[model samples]
Target: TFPTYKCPETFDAWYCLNDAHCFAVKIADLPVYSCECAIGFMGQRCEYKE
Candidate 1:
């Protein structure tokens, strides 16, 4: 519960969901760590629902 799709290594979704699931992406030099929550959560930090 402390490892997954993190940005290089420092970036992670520790505050996202209990599943500890997340991902990262880079666009034109901007790297970002996004959250991949459950079926009920849909947001950068699980702030919304699906």
Candidate 2:
């Protein structure tokens, strides 16, 4: 079996630089991910501000 694990739900909402927002968790196997900038922001990993 691959086994199963549980992550923290309250461990959501990540803070990116320049007023950006991202998700703290993704999938069970892939828990860590990148940032997704909010409005007026854009970049490879939401690093640009407009």
Candidate 3:
């Protein structure tokens, strides 16, 4: 569950922004949830990609 994860992985990346933690990431380009920046990140997309 570290490098690899389930679909719609629950912000497995360190950059899960909001303390709300309501968002997640998926493999598909067309994501149901936009890559909104979390607490550590800036802008809508993650500043860093792990």
Best by lDDT: 1
- Model 1 lDDT, residue 42, Cα: 72
Per-residue lDDT over 1-50 for candidate 1, one digit per residue giving the tens place of the 0 to 100 score:
33334655544525565454667666666766777777777776776766
Q: Candidate 3: worst 10 consecutive residues by lDDT?
A: 1-10
Taken over the whole model, the C-alpha lDDT of each candidate is 0.61, 0.53, 0.43
lDDT (Cα, tens digit) per residue for candidate 2, span 1-50: 33333324442243354565445454665666445577888775676776
Per-candidate TM-scores read 0.53, 0.41, 0.22
lDDT value, candidate 1, whole model = 0.61
Q: Point out where model 1 deviates above 4 Å.
A: 1-5, 8-10, 47-50
Q: Please list the Cα RMSD from the true structure of every candidate, rounded to 1 decimal place.
A: 6.1, 6.9, 9.5
> Considering summed lDDT, which 10 consecutive residues are worst modelled in model 2?
3-12
In the range 1-32, model 3's lDDT, one tens digit per residue, is 31333325544444344432325344554434
Off by over 4 Å in 3: 1-7, 14-31, 48-50
Q: In candidate 2, which residue ranges exceed 4 Å CA deviation?
A: 1-15
TM-score leaderboard ranking: 1, 2, 3
The per-residue C-alpha lDDT of model 3 at residue 30 equals 43
